[PDB]
Symmetry: D2
């Protein structure tokens, strides 16, 4: 049986409340909770941090990537237990920075461990299956939830409470898990892991990138505040195909001319923010995010900014990764 | 044949755009008025006020309304009108994903189907409607789901009201939440709305956007939360402060479907916060601005979030 | 606390299966009866008749019903009950995608949420319901969408009625089509139903299935059509014959969402055919069997397809 | 500009009615209808047949595959105009039998050419874009509809009237088309085209394979009728995960023992009909269809039957193609 390391970070997978009914709510304990894991793997757990993923942050990301990269040779695969709220952000960061070519699988739960029909046990089982499968390697960093293997780039949470929330809403899943076996029919084409130039091994921190939302009568104050604090990048959560309210547009145009990287994404939950629509990016020094949602576009923008501040180079990164 | 008024506001879709679909004459007597002409990314409170007042004033002059509008913020305008319109004649919003000069432009048939909807007596008393891609959608739940797809508009939590085939609608649903003349929001004498901003949550979220709104003395802030409406620690600290300091706080979610619930990880009562339910952040803004015309009490705001 | 009766029929989910969720005692007084014990792939007309009669008889003895049932044909049974049940107390169907012995079994919480639904006074007068994966779904539109996913059950055309969170339901919709005591189907004295078969369309489709049904003198045939209810040429020839010869013909579709419409490629009137609307083939069967208890006239059958 | 051949077969793309409003309803004419095609390709049209796709049949399939295979060297790509009703069946047949390694793209329309906001013109444009793109080769046979490139295996029609009906409901699309450009992020892993052993070049007909539906109180008469006519194969459209009503089960078990190939699929619109569920396939001589829906499982079963009648070999084909 393969050796699989679980790196725990917290999340509802590790949460609990006073009741198995009511909605209000350690890695050794999790493992003992799923004894069946011994049928499939030799499991070792490490608790890396213990936070709700609503409090996920750059340092946790750097700590995870460096640890995976450092421990690659000591294990056959990793499982990361993580909250659902920002799982899609961490998974993409790891998909761009991990250089290990063993599976890295993220997993969480939508119901607390203490609740009736808790999804965490079987999710964890399925994540270990995935991390153990030789066919899971070279697919990038993965998320496994509700019997489905999802690529770290496209995966996002679609519903606030549904156990089936995680979907790759633009390009679909990679494989489905039945009876402990995966039929893989897809692999992401965008470059990942050892095919990216991002190397976080020596980094102590990440460039500052903020996100602003667009809607009717949007205030420019959020954007101005990021500009005044000297943010390296700003991502716009645009309306429709990446459009901005005028006041927001004017602040971001000015910023871009002072060297602030500006990426247009969309608050719309699927589809690409495209070039050659209503915004002349080349003219303003803006970058179109493609299918990257605003939180995901931030991940790439941060990493882009460790290599270049040039908008045209940043656009090329947004076309390749 | 019914009398239908088209109010144009702009968008990728008013005499010329009428004339172009001569089949409209088969189903209605159409009169066109240009209210404003803007990309719907520049939609604002003033346009909203103008529209509600115009429909409310002109209600007995016509048998229904069609509003042509850009796709980007259609779901915001529809819900604003849904809460402020007192006319119980059909009000139908329509736009287009493809330019009118493009191959297979969606605008013409969309306009046709919107007029079909506005002229159907069965469409009345269903609140403000959005008609796109052969489907009638309620103004509260409707939202744009893809950046380019002609099928983008969906009612992602509770589904459509009816589908349009061969110029007829089989309606099987109507919105239970109170709308139009069952709301107390009356905008007939207002010239501005309360100031409500939206801030985004994500890993390592800056508190600076939320701080800038609080420093400007905004009347409300809506959080586009992570998961079930949760807040990055910095953001939560700054909002905890706002809520006790004169700024109403509504937790919504950046997640595209499902409710931001009470009784999850956030003690709303302790902090003075309101849970948005199924209202996404831009929708929650609409209802929060209108709640703030009536009250500033977070308990009363939460009750409004529970009924409209 | 309400009195709730659980009727068990089998499935991958009645004293033992009760006792296993001791939290039920927090919300209801539950009484259990085993009606039959089968895999729902073997569901049949007799079980359906038994259930309708039992609910209709026992209606004043309890405050609501929960039917435990396999997933495979749940959507057929729910719609049959939806049309034949005259009790206006909640009737809620529930099953499980995963075995009760499996890791993260869905059955326990599903049962809990079904009892929550059956006990809610707001659930009454909404027709027969299916409660799965935190969602209340109307018996007419509900269907199983994936072969293994715990989230399989969806109302794919008109959406759910309500979502269940923390033991409470926010209902925002109710089915407009007539159900339960607004139907004329009365099954209280019947011991069998009319014979209705389903045939599939695809390229190079054999007419032999349809012929074998016609040769047996079936009372109806439902076509699982291609696209908008269309028929392979051989199949159309044989059905054209059936419809004039004593066998009612309903065009449905193998396509998983959307209506089989009138006024498309098939002259329904000329052939004596009925268009199913949104009813998929197994659902159309249910309504056709029940129409055939009242009439054999294709015009009257089409009217029934337009109201229920 | 590339040379692109359009092979027309009919469909609503080539339909019409008396009105642009009402719902009731040649390849040279189609082409002249989309003058913009000259900006992207040198288009030549051939009318192969002219039928509604509800009347699609084995001979049309054999004629198409042999013509593509024969004309491969005379053109840079094919577009096939086809009705929507059975497009998903023809596309899979072609995905298994075409040996040409130039793009083969299928296209149709949901609204008639004569109707307001007719989808056919832009769909045809987008299909030619796709057939012209060098990156579209080696992806198998494709369907292009509503700005989306879909693989012939997973693609199916999901709605009776919606222009956006075509989706790859299990594994997602291959790429999206904006402004005449495709960003491809996926390719099907199942073996297709020149990687399959199916060779239809000399075939005059195809093995007989019928489909039976399962529901409550299902009659066994449909199945018995296929059995009595000596059908080479039967596909079951099962309930839930491929289950059968008892009467249907007994007839198909008996058949299988007389050498009839029996494949279990599902009437459920997504997800695999799996092995190791409630049916012991190895015991009855049955084959599980996987993600293949009943009409798609028929396509593969027909072709399987040109090579073998052995259930275990047929199962292996159902695991590879
Ligand atoms: N707030 C939790 C949500 C979950 O895990 O379900 C987290 O992200 O840590
Ligand atoms: N930017 C346009 C988008 C569209 O209508 O397609 C608008 O909202 O006006
Ligand atoms: N075959 C089972 C499927 C399930 O319930 O999961 C049944 O319908 O009884
Ligand atoms: N019956 C038509 C449907 C369409 O093309 O839209 C066909 O398949 O030929």
């Amino acid at each position: 049986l393969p050796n699989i390391t679980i790196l725990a970070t917290g999340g509802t997978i590790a949460g609990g409340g006073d009741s198995a009914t009511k909605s209000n709510y350690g890695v050794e304990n999790l493992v003992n909770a799923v004894p069946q894991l011994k049928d499939i793997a030799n499991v070792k757990g490490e608790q890396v941090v213990n936070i709700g993923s609503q409090d996920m942050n750059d340092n946790v990301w750097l700590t995870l990537a460096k640890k995976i990269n450092t421990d690659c040779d000591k294990t056959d695969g990793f499982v990361i237990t993580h909250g659902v709220d920002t799982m899609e952000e961490t998974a993409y960061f790891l998909d761009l920075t991990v250089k290990c070519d063993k599976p890295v699988v993220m997993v969480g739960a939508m119901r607390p461990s203490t609740s009736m029909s808790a999804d965490g046990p079987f999710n964890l089982y399925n994540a270990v299956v995935t991390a153990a499968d030789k066919a899971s390697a070279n697919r990038g960093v993965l998320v496994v939830m509700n019997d489905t293997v999802l690529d770290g780039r496209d995966v996002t949470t679609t519903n606030t409470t549904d156990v089936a929330t995680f979907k790759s809403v633009n390009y679909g899943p990679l494989g489905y898990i039945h009876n402990g076996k995966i039929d893989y029919q897809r692999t992401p084409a965008r470059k990942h892991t050892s095919d990216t130039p991002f190397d976080v091994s020596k980094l102590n921190e990440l460039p500052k990138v903020g996100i602003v939302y667009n809607y009717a009568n949007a205030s420019d104050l959020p954007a101005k505040a990021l500009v005044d604090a000297g943010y390296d990048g700003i991502v716009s959560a645009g309306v429709g195909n990446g459009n901005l309210y005028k006041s927001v547009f004017d602040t971001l145009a000015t910023a871009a001319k002072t060297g602030t990287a500006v990426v247009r994404s969309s608050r719309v939950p699927t589809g690409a923010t495209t070039q050659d629509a209503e915004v002349d990016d080349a003219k303003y020094g803006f970058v179109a995010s493609g299918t990257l949602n605003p939180q995901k576009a931030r991940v790439l923008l941060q990493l882009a900014l460790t290599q270049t501040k040039d908008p045209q180079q940043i656009q090329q990164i947004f076309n390749q990764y």
